[PDB]
Design a binder for this molecule. Structure first.
Ligand SMILES: Cc1cc2nc3c(=O)[nH]c(=O)nc-3n(C[C@H](O)[C@H](O)[C@H](O)COP(=O)(O)O)c2cc1C
Ligand SMILES: Cc1cc(N[C@H]2CCc3ccc(Br)cc3C2)n2nc(C(C)(F)F)nc2n1
Ligand SMILES: CCCCCCCCCCCC[N+](C)(C)[O-]
Ligand SMILES: O=C(O)c1cc(=O)[nH]c(=O)[nH]1
Length: 363
């Protein structure tokens, strides 16, 4: 379509000449003004998926760090994504590290960043999410679309559990799921359990029925996911895997950015974590490991170097039930969701899968 094509041209221009974070904020602004294209197509009923009772109309969403402050949830979802993870948010606002703090490498389709958890803080973002939830009631294209919220600690926190607790008390009512982003097995167990308790306490301390308590999509309490970084050793992964089973966690997001990459020349003297195509193989391997160490009792959300339908099926066959995009949107533009959904549908057919669910963990 011409709407997608025109923006993809503008994107490639922007990619060549303009600073990354400036580009990002610009396009976010365009989304806020609601002048980005829509994908109004019906998603294949065979590519639908779920994390327990949380149902996704298709297997592609947008990862955390893209719309940190939830300023244009509508427009991003309407590009064809089934869900978005806003945040990571913190209890108080943070400016993050010094700019410029994000850099791309087009030929390797990789990104490096050291943002330092810049965000408007839980109060403001909660206000933004509420406004979205009200629009969602009115907007036909937002029905059954999921919004998760990634929460983290402040830069100089007094207590991590209390930081996450503050966020949950503020924004939990409006979230379909919560992503814990922070890592010793002992500390993690405490963190995970406190989060579950505080979510359960929202149900308790309210006199309203669920239909009027959970102002979200599921009309139930938010699930609890945890997001893991790829830079762990095997003993660390096994220990974590146990805690996630002990705590009965609803899902795990595999994975965040890596520091193990150094063969990107333009990133030679650059500081931060890498994402994009170079993270793909590392991330896929991580999924297989945690899918095994866990005995497949914890659903997985895939993240890392997913650009194509082919890339998607790898993550799924490794154990993932859903996929998150970020770098793809930077390098492929507005068509990312429309394209990847089409490719995965073709692939699931040619490979002789009846539906997507059948392909999870096959390899
Ligand atoms: C600029 C930037 C900001 C990010 N911010 C967050 C964040 O706030 N919270 C989080 O969990 N992950 C964050 N991430 C990691 C992404 O959510 C994602 O896990 C990672 O980029 C791998 O996906 P990709 O290879 O498709 O880009 C960020 C990544 C980038 C590049
Ligand atoms: C040219 C261009 C663009 C870009 N993001 C865009 C992607 C496409 C898109 C679509 C809808 C909405 Br709403 C928002 C955005 C943000 N980025 N992001 C970075 C980085 C590495 F994060 F800095 N560089 C970029 N360069
Ligand atoms: C030279 C500028 C290139 C961008 C093209 C701008 C026109 C796009 C119009 C999209 C319509 C938005 N929508 C779907 C909400 O109507
Ligand atoms: O905000 C950031 O700097 C950030 C957070 C995160 O979780 N992952 C990442 O790569 N960057």
């Amino acid at each position: 379509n011409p709407e997608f094509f025109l923006y993809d041209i503008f994107l490639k221009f922007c990619l060549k000449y303009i600073d990354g974070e400036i580009c990002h904020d610009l396009f976010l602004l365009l989304g806020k003004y609601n002048i980005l294209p829509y994908d109004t197509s019906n998603d294949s009923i065979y590519a639908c998926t779920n994390i327990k009772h949380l149902d996704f109309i298709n297997p592609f969403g947008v990862a955390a760090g893209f719309d940190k402050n939830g300023v244009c949830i509508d427009s991003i979802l309407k590009l064809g994504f089934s869900f978005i993870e806003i945040g990571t948010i913190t209890p108080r606002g943070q400016t993050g590290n010094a700019k410029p703090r994000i850099f791309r490498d087009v030929e390797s389709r990789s990104i490096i960043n050291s943002c330092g958890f810049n965000n408007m803080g839980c109060d403001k973002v909660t206000e933004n999410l509420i406004l979205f939830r009200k629009r969602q009631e009115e907007d036909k294209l937002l029905s059954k679309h999921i919004v998760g919220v990634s929460i983290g600690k402040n830069k100089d926190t007094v207590n991590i559990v209390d930081d996450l607790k503050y966020c949950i008390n503020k924004i939990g009512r409006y979230a379909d799921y919560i992503a814990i982003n922070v890592q010793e097995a002992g500390k993690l167990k405490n963190i995970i359990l406190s989060v579950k308790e505080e979510i359960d306490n929202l149900e308790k301390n309210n006199i309203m029925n669920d239909e009027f308590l959970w102002f979200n999509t599921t009309k139930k309490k938010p699930l609890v996911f945890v997001k893991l970084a790829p830079d762990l050793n095997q003993e660390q992964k096994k220990e974590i895997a146990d805690v996630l089973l002990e705590t009965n966690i609803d899902g795990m997001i595999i994975s965040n950015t890596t520091t193990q990459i150094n063969d990107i020349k333009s990133f030679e003297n650059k500081k931060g974590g890498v994402s994009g195509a170079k993270l793909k193989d590392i991330s896929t391997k991580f999924i297989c490991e945690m899918y095994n160490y866990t005995n497949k009792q914890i659903p997985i959300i895939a993240s890392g170097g997913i650009f194509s339908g082919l890339d998607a099926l790898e993550k799924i066959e490794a154990g993932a039930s859903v996929c998150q995009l970020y770098s793809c949107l930077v390098f492929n533009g507005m068509k990312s969701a429309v394209q990847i959904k089409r490719e995965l549908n073709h692939l699931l057919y040619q490979r002789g899968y009846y539906n997507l669910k059948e392909a999870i963990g096959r390899k």
